[PDB]
């Protein structure tokens, strides 16, 4: 088992996740993963986005845990590890609001 993340923030709530992502100058696609605040055992993917109405804001996606191991945001794209999920969505949005461009600095 290889043991190894800048983008993982542990027990960080939604509000404090948004404060870190909305730091000045971070692009759309700045992101982090944290424990879910409202579904125990799951994770949350928090991504900086922009639209004309909301301006700079954060979108949150539930990363669900498969009962017997692994992770997904949509059931048709499953991953063994959070690292593999992040690498996948760094390469293509594939339904997310945008790609995972840079871990929250």
């Amino acid at each position: 088992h290889h043991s190894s993340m800048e983008w993982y923030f542990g027990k960080l709530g939604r509000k404090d996740a948004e404060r870190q992502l909305l730091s000045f100058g971070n692009p759309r696609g700045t992101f982090l993963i944290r424990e879910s605040e409202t579904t125990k055992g799951a994770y949350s993917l928090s991504i900086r986005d922009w639209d004309d109405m909301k301006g700079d804001h954060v979108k949150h996606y539930k990363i669900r845990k498969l009962d017997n191991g692994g992770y997904y945001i949509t059931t048709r794209a499953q991953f063994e590890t959070l690292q593999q999920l992040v690498q996948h969505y760094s390469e293509r949005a594939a339904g997310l609001c945008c790609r995972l461009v840079v871990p929250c600095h």
Binding site: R14, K59, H60, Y61, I73, A77, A94, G95, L96
Partner: peptide
């Protein structure tokens, strides 16, 4: 209960 986004599915 807070808002979470979902990946849209298209047929």
């Amino acid at each position: 209960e807070p808002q979470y986004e979902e990946i849209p599915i298209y047929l």
